[PDB]
Each structure stands twice: as C-alpha cells, then as structure tokens.
Amino acid sequence: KAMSARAEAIKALVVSRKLDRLAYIAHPKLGKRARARIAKGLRLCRPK
RNA sequence: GAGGCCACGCGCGCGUCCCCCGAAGAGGGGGACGGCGGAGCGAGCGCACGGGGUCGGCGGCGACGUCGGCU
Numbered sequence A: 001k002a003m004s005a006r007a008e009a010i011k012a013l014v015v016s017r018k019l020d021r022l023a024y025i026a027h028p029k030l031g032k033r034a035r036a037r038i039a040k041g042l043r044l045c046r047p048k
Numbered sequence B: 001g002a003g004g005c006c007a008c009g010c011g012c013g014c015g016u017c018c019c020c021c022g023a024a025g026a027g028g029g030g031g032a033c034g035g036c037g038g039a040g041c042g043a044g045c046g047c048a049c050g051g052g053g054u055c056g057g058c059g060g061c062g063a064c065g066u067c068g069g070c071u
Helices: A002-010 A018-026 A032-043
Strands: none
Touching: A018 A032
C-alpha cells in the first residue's frame, strides 16, 4: 500500500560569445552541422 | 570625417538587434550577428625551426717498405 500510494503520488502530474561559439563548433557532435556550413562557405561562391 | 588590427569573407529562408518611412508606432523597405533550416567533391605545384643525419661533397696515400689490428 505504501508503494502504491507513493506510485500514484509520483504519477500525479498537473549574443555572439565568440569563445563559446567556437567551443560549440569544436564539439564532435554538437558542431557537426555548424562546421559543415562553413565548409560549403569556403567552396561555393554565389552572387547577390 | 581627406591610420592600426581581425584564425572576418557564397547565396536563399529563418530567427535576435539596430535604421527608415511608420498612410493604427500596422506594412514593407535596409544594415549587423547567428551556435538555426533536407539533401555528397576542390586539385596542382612548391618552401619548410615540422613523428631522432645526411651530402645527388671532397682530398691524400699505398708492396720487400709501409697500412690496420683499443685485445
């Protein structure tokens, strides 16, 4: 009974920062898409 | 408005901030930043204070007198 009472009580629901940005890009997983963006920037050149 | 530095450099759209007119301080027109968004790839020569020396540098001397042998 104590386990059930506890279980039902628990289930009762209702800028830039350059140095921070570079550490984010250097992350192997968090910065994967970020450093892919800058790679395409190095290659492609487009007007406008 | 008659210099110095930057390990700052593609677009499109999204966001954040700043600017304009603002004809509801609506609605569009512009700048800056972004760590945001589903879609592949740079190669080709070199120089080196770069994961422990190499020269694609050279000279002299050599048989009955001398050459080498730290034992």
